[PDB]
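Dear U.,

Please find below the material for section 3 of the report. The protein was modelled together with zinc ion; I have listed the sequence and SMILES used, followed by the predicted complex structure.
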Amino acid sequence: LGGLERFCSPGKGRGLRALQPFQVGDLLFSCPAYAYVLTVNERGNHCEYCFTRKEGLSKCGRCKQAFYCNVECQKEDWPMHKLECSPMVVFGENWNPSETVRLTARILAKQKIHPERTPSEKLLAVKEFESHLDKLDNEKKDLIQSDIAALHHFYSKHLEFPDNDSLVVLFAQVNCNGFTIEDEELSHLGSAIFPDVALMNHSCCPNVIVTYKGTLAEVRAVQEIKPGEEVFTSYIDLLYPTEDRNDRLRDSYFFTCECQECTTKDKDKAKVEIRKLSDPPKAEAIRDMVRYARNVIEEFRRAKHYKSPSELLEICELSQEKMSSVFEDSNVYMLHMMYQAMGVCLYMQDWEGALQYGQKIIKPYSKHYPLYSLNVASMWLKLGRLYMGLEHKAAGEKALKKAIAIMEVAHGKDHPYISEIKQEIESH
Ligand SMILES: C[S@@+](CC[C@H](N)C(=O)[O-])C[C@H]1O[C@@H](n2cnc3c(N)ncnc32)[C@H](O)[C@@H]1O
Ligand SMILES: [Zn+2]
Ligand SMILES: [Zn+2]
Ligand SMILES: [Zn+2]
């Protein structure tokens, strides 16, 4: 709470303000999760209650699909696991609510259980969340209804559903204020709601970073903050040019960024770096390849749900072949396809393929992103772990050290993830 304040940020609604100075790597505040969910694919790898990544995980006898550190965690998570335990077994293979429906069901359960202001709502309350209901078109309003139907379909037993479709308000609120809990390699662990953290506005030049210590959100300065200065995070991936960033912010958050980077368009020429080839491309040759680039990102986005790894790798190489003609290999659109391919090799357990892609990525990655970037820290981590795994321990230790350098600021020097990497350098 201390040394910070809620205020009306002009043309940004409510926001967070500093009342004291903050230095690079300082914890402004922590926020316990108000409501949270462990992602289906991480069940058994982490405790459902505290999110501890351990090996001696005790399975829920009643459903065989919830794992905990012990019985104390099992007991504590029951008021929330109660919502899914029996349904999972009764519906079996037919149990498929989206993580949004899963999280929203828990928000409804927390309101029944704890109607009072929670210690997660010191400055902002879930009830007070911005919905953007008024800007929702007929397509978006319909998607919320598909999700309201699922909430009724699967969580009808223990929940008393509110008013009309003032559930449309709750779903829109989660869509606009919800959080994704990622791991040290930026892999999806789950979804949560953090009220006080949701008060911070967006900047493509963030002065803070949100990291997670179990289910607790921690906010640390990645730039020096002086009194009266507004505290800003990044809502989106900062690799992309101004237009791309702004299309994402408009679609998901109903606003346009007017920050230094968006006003100036500084990193745009380097991000979409054109080959300095004998006879230039032409204005329309760039614009046609950028239209092709965006299309292939989205085509791969779709494809990955239904194509084989080799089919998926072919898309990467053939996209990079067509674009190679116009675009430099440092070009963000080239980097995207290389990252995707690295991801495919990792899945196939092709460690050399993944390492040979990661090396091509890291240098332009560091350049296109800010100084302390989780995107670059995790890329150093994947590289260090690929090196260490393949027995190239010199290069592994250097890449792992590079990761730790960023993490000491973003995660804090005393973070479990950092003690884990240090123990990776000690043994192997
Ligand atoms: C997670 S909330 C942040 C707190 C918020 N302004 C409020 O008072 O509820 C997200 C919403 O805040 C606004 N917002 C965040 N960053 C912004 C920015 N840089 N410029 C304009 N509006 C912004 C948009 O309405 C966005 O959808
Ligand atoms: Zn636990
Ligand atoms: Zn169970
Ligand atoms: Zn911006």
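For the text of the report, you could mention the following: Residues 108 and 159 are 7 Å apart (CA to CA).

Regards,
Y.
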